[PDB]
Amino acid sequence: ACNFQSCWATCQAQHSIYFRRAFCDRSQCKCVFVRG
Numbered sequence: 001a002c003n004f005q006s007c008w009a010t011c012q013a014q015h016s017i018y019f020r021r022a023f024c025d026r027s028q029c030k031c032v033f034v035r036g
Helices: 004-014
Strands: 019-025 028-033
Touching: 004 019, 004 028
Parallel strands: none
Antiparallel strands: 019 028
């Protein structure tokens, strides 16, 4: 199971201003973020 809102919150909470977006990739929470 994967949840968009839950994933977004998780990804946003950990990732700082480098956080792009968050979503469900396949069936797993995927966090998008840049390095530099």
